[PDB]
Amino acid sequence: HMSGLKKFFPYSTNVLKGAAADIALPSLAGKTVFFYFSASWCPPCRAFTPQLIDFYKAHAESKNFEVMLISWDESAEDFKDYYAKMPWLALPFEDRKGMEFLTTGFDVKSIPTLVGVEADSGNIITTQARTMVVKDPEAKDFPWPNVEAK
Amino acid sequence: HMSGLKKFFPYSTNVLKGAAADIALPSLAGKTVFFYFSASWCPPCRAFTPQLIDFYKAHAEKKNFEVMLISWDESAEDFKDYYAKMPWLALPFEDRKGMEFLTTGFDVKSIPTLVGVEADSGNIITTQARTMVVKDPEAKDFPWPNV
């Protein structure tokens, strides 16, 4: 059940949500999920994050998607402060190997990077959603499959 | 000849096969052709490809079918190293327009996506080959018709 999404998380069954660390993956059924590779020490992330946050507040519910922070922060403390500023989900910091698995899996060489996947099938939509969040703020072409074509 | 399948390729007369690049569509006559939408940046593809490779090498001749890579790679260099590892066919990377035509035609919204079509009628025979390759490694119910 939800084996597609589970393939992205060999070492975690639950992800964080602000206060609680109790949201279970299967609760994302039917949604488009975006992995956001980001960190507090990254200048472009600091500039992109507020943009992603506006996009999230505008379309999350309507377009039925979720966002999950996958942190490249180097300390549990930095992670905690940085993630406090976001409204979406996060892969716990303690799951470093899970961060590494996702980072290598999608070939993420730099941040910020925003990867869109389908929860139900576990299929990938695009690794280049970061650009589209700003180019298509009204989400007319969401979730932007194969942006890589351009 | 091969009028129907030829319409799937409005911009390429020949397709790849290793280092080749001289494969003509007429060779695919009377066969089932699987359009495999994939890219190096895709984890589920990376896990399915070796399964499809085993399946190809074990049934391509008997059940007589072919596989063609339709690449969502972001660059010619990525395509090159990614395709180098596959044994089947590929739509030339440079034909981005072609890849987009086929993407729109099969309505591919994410990858991996594997679609089987009857080369002769250009009809889609099956849309569940991705699942069934895994559930039916032996190729008992191939080609799992569902359209």
CATH at B33: 3.40.30.10
Q: How far is CA B129 from the centre of its chain?
A: 11
| Residue B63 dihedral angles phi and psi, to the nearest 5° | -65, 0
How determined? Answer: X-ray
| Residue A71 dihedral angles phi and psi, to the nearest 5° | -85, 130
3-state helix, strand, coil in chain A (%, to 5): 35, 25, 40
Q: Who contacts B61 (Cβ-Cβ below 8 Å, separation ≥6)?
A: none
With b meaning 16 or more CB within 10 Å and e meaning fewer, what string describes B34-66?
Answer: bbbbbbbbbbbbeebbeebeebbeebbeeeebb
Chain B, residues 86-145, CB within 8 A of chain A, namely 96, 99-100, 103, 108-113
Mutate to test the interface with B, among A126, A146, A147, A150 (most CBs of B within 10 A): A146
**CA gap A100, A131 in Å, rounded:** 23
Closest CA to A122 of A104, A140, A147, A105: A105
Residue B59 is which amino acid?
Answer: H
Could you give the number of structural domains in chain A?
1
**CA gap A26, A56 in Å, rounded:** 20
User: In which domain, by residue range, is B104 found?
Assistant: 1-147
Residue B70 is which amino acid?
Answer: I
**CA gap B129, A80 in Å, rounded:** 44
State the burial class of residue A53 (Cβ atoms within 10 Å of its Cβ: 0-12, 13-18, 19+).
middle
Closest CA to B52 of B107, B124, B5, B111: B111
Contacts of B109 in chain A (CB under 8 A): 118, 125, 145
CB atoms within 10 A of CB A50: 10
Task: Check whether the bond before B143 is cis (ω within 30° of 0).
Answer: yes
Name the residue with tokens 């660390």: A21
Distance between start and end Cα atoms, chain A: 35
Strand partners, A124: A117, B111
| Cβ atoms of residues A111 and A42 within 8 Å | yes
Partner-chain residue, chosen from B45, B74, B112, that has the shortest CB–CB distance to A148: B74
Closest CA to B95 of B32, B19, B21, B145: B21
Closest CA to A125 of A35, A28, A15: A35
